């Protein structure tokens, strides 16, 4: 039944938490609700697909040019994380 490995599952969980904290920080700075910056669904997708570029984040459902620019800090988190830990990035099907 499971398609992903145990290690991939843990990586997604760990990265997701870092994205939640980065979203909170950036939303607090912009004085906006966290969900206005990115919904939980967007964050789940970002933890799974791991976009590291602006062009790649835009391929995620619900991420426009404007949101992509707002998500720059989180793209930095994903690239830092996936470097320190040795995991695959930019996992897109199409
Ligand atoms: Cl976490």
UniProtKB/Swiss-Prot annotation:
HRDC domain spans which residues?
Answer: 9-88
Protein name per Swiss-Prot or TrEMBL: Bifunctional 3'-5' exonuclease/ATP-dependent helicase WRN
Q: Which gene encodes it?
A: WRN
How does this chain assemble?
A: Monomer, and homooligomer. May exist as homodimer, homotrimer, homotetramer and/or homohexamer. Homotetramer, or homohexamer, when bound to DNA. Interacts via its N-terminal domain with WRNIP1. Interacts with EXO1, PCNA and SUPV3L1. Interacts with PML (isoform PML-4). Interacts (via KBM motif) with XRCC5 and XRCC6; promoting recruitment to DNA damage sites. Interacts with RECQL5; this interaction stimulates WRN helicase activity on DNA fork duplexes.
Q: Give the record's PTM text.
A: Phosphorylated by PRKDC.
What pathology does the entry list?
A: Werner syndrome: A rare autosomal recessive progeroid syndrome characterized by the premature onset of multiple age-related disorders, including atherosclerosis, cancer, non-insulin-dependent diabetes mellitus, ocular cataracts and osteoporosis. The major cause of death, at a median age of 47, is myocardial infarction. Colorectal cancer: A complex disease characterized by malignant lesions arising from the inner wall of the large intestine (the colon) and the rectum. Genetic alterations are often associated with progression from premalignant lesion (adenoma) to invasive adenocarcinoma. Risk factors for cancer of the colon and rectum include colon polyps, long-standing ulcerative colitis, and genetic family history.
Superkingdom of the source?
Eukaryota
Q: What is known of its domains?
A: The KBM 2 (Ku-binding motif 2) and XLM (XLF-like motif) mediate cooperative interaction with XRCC5/Ku80 and XRCC6/Ku70 and recruitment to DNA damage sites. The isolated helicase core (residues 517-1093) interacts weakly with the HDRC domain in vitro.
Q: Where in the cell is it found?
A: Nucleus, Nucleolus; Nucleus; Nucleus, Nucleoplasm; Chromosome
State its role: Multifunctional enzyme that has magnesium and ATP-dependent 3'-5' DNA-helicase activity on partially duplex substrates. Also has 3'->5' exonuclease activity towards double-stranded (ds)DNA with a 5'-overhang. Has no nuclease activity towards single-stranded (ss)DNA or blunt-ended dsDNA. Helicase activity is most efficient with (d)ATP, but (d)CTP will substitute with reduced efficiency; strand displacement is enhanced by single-strand binding-protein (heterotrimeric replication protein A complex, RPA1, RPA2, RPA3).
The cysteines joined by S-S bonds are: none
Which portion of the entire protein is included? Answer: 1142 to 1235 of 1432
Q: Which family does it belong to?
A: Belongs to the helicase family. RecQ subfamily.
């Amino acid at each position: 039944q499971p398609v992903i490995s145990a290690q991939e599952q843990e990586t997604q969980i760990v990265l997701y938490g870092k994205l939640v904290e980065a979203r909170q920080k950036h939303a607090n700075k912009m004085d906006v609700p966290p969900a206005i910056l990115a919904t939980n669904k967007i964050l789940v997708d970002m933890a799974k697909m791991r976009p590291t570029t602006v062009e790649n984040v835009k391929r995620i459902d619900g991420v426009s040019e404007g949101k992509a620019a707002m998500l720059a800090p989180l793209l930095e988190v994903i690239k830092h994380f996936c470097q320190t830990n040795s995991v695959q990035t930019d996992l897109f099907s199409s």
